């Protein structure tokens, strides 16, 4: 009795899963590639840890996240594999509940972690108060496609403080500030959307995971988590928070997955 965990997002979630690669099974819950490959962490990422380390029962991971993704290239563009295209891949391959992924409302969890790149690319060129509702409304419409397919369990991660990644720190404190203030408005609107969607549907189980506050706690007191500082980069994924200048390592992702586990119990796999 597996939980089918369909995920959507950017490089903080990518594993390089192909819909034509080996598909998830009890003996191989990630499908492809092997657990620990394909990420920006030097090892498993939060999805690999949620699926294989923090799981309370069998979780099968279908991870459609793609590097650099924004929500929709008609709003903030970046790479072809935007969130809209990830939802289209889902609609093409998995939405109709094929024998390979025979999911139902009671055992499918749809996890979305998006917005890092929309904010990263639009924080100085757009008005957060009036532009972020457009991004959030497009996200909501994509979620509605899965709802129409019969999805009822949803996990949304808010945007973490990429303002304090080395890539942004290097641009100066006033840019860190401009980005952080825009990001705060995005995250508030995301929370409002998840709340409104949950109330209006009435038949959904949702979790909004506050990655922003969790990562911020670590950045503010890195030695309490065994990191020497909040700025160093180490591609071993464990010696520093940062695996490269814009992406945290496997140790951070494990800490996040462990923080998320109790919050995900209501979704069925944790």
Task: State the CATH number of the domain containing residue 76.
Answer: 3.40.50.1110
Mapping DSSP to helix (H, G, I), strand (E, B) and coil, where does residue 6 land? strand
For 110: left if phi > 0, alpha if psi spans -120 to 50, otherwise beta; the answer is beta
CB 187 within 8 A of CB 181: no
Sign of CA dihedral 43, 47, 51, 56: positive
Number of domain units in the chain: 1
- Three-state secondary structure call for residue 239: coil
The answer to whether 154 and 206 have CB atoms below 8 angstroms apart is yes
- Residue where the block lists tokens 């720190």: 169
Provide the 3-class DSSP secondary structure of residue 33: coil
Question: Resolution, rounded to a tenth of an Å?
Answer: 1.5
Phi and psi dihedrals of 215, rounded to 5? -60, -40
Give the integer Cα–Cα distance in Å for 72 and 206. Answer: 22
Q: How far apart are CA 165 and CA 242, in angstroms?
A: 8
Question: Please, are residues 44 and 255 in contact by the beta-carbon 8 Å criterion?
Answer: no
Q: Which domain holds residue 134?
A: 3-267
Across 85-97, b (16+ Cβ under 10 Å) vs e yields bbbbbbeebbbee
Residue with tokens 């952080």: 180
d(CA 109, CA 4): 6
User: Which H helix or E strand runs over 136?
Assistant: helix 128-149
Neighbouring CB atoms inside 10 A of 266's CB total: 12
Strand order in the sheet with 153-157: 59-63, 3-9, 108-113, 153-157, 205-209
CA pair distance 84, 73, nearest whole angstrom: 8
DSSP string, 213-236: HHHHHHHHSGGGGT-S-SS-B-TT
Instruction: Tell me which method was used to determine the 3D structure.
Output: X-ray
CA–centroid distance for 50 within its chain: 12
Q: Which helix (H) or strand (E) holds 155?
A: strand 153-157
Contact 245, 167 (CB under 8 A): yes
170 by Cβ neighbours in 10 Å (0-12 / 13-18 / 19+) ranks as: exposed
What is the C-alpha to C-alpha distance for residues 249 and 22, in angstroms, rounded to an integer? Answer: 26
- Count other Cβ atoms within 10 Å, centred on residue 235: 14
Q: In whole angstroms, what is the distance from residue 86 CA to residue 46 CA?
A: 18
């Amino acid at each position: 009795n597996p939980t089918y965990f369909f995920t959507f997002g950017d490089s903080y979630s990518q594993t390089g899963f192909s819909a034509s690669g080996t598909q998830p099974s009890a003996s191989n819950p990630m499908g492809n590639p092997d657990l620990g490959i394909g990420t920006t962490t030097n090892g498993p990422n939060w999805i690999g840890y949620l699926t294989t380390t923090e799981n309370a029962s069998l979780v099968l991971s279908y991870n459609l996240a793609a590097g650099g993704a924004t929500i929709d290239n008609a709003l903030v563009p970046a790479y072809p594999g935007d969130l809209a295209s990830q939802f289209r891949l889902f609609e093409d391959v998995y939405a109709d509940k094929p024998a390979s992924a025979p999911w139902s409302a009671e055992d499918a969890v749809f996890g979305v972690w998006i917005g890092i790149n929309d904010i990263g690319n639009a924080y100085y060129s757009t008005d957060a108060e009036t532009y972020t509702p457009k991004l959030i409304s497009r996200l909501e419409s994509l979620v509605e496609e899965v709802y129409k397919n019969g999805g009822r369990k949803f996990l949304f991660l808010n945007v973490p403080p990429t303002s304090r990644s080395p890539l942004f720190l290097e641009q100066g404190e006033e840019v860190v500030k401009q980005h952080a203030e825009y990001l705060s408005v995005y995250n508030e609107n995301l929370e409002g959307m998840v709340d409104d969607f949950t109330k209006k549907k009435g038949d959904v189980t949702t979790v909004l995971y506050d990655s922003w506050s969790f990562m911020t706690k670590i950045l503010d007191d890195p030695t309490a988590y065994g990191f020497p500082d909040a700025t160093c980069i180490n591609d071993d994924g464990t010696s520093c928070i940062w695996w490269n200048n814009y992406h945290p390592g496997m140790k951070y992702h494990l800490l996040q997955a462990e923080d998320m586990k109790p919050k995900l119990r209501k979704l069925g796999g944790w």
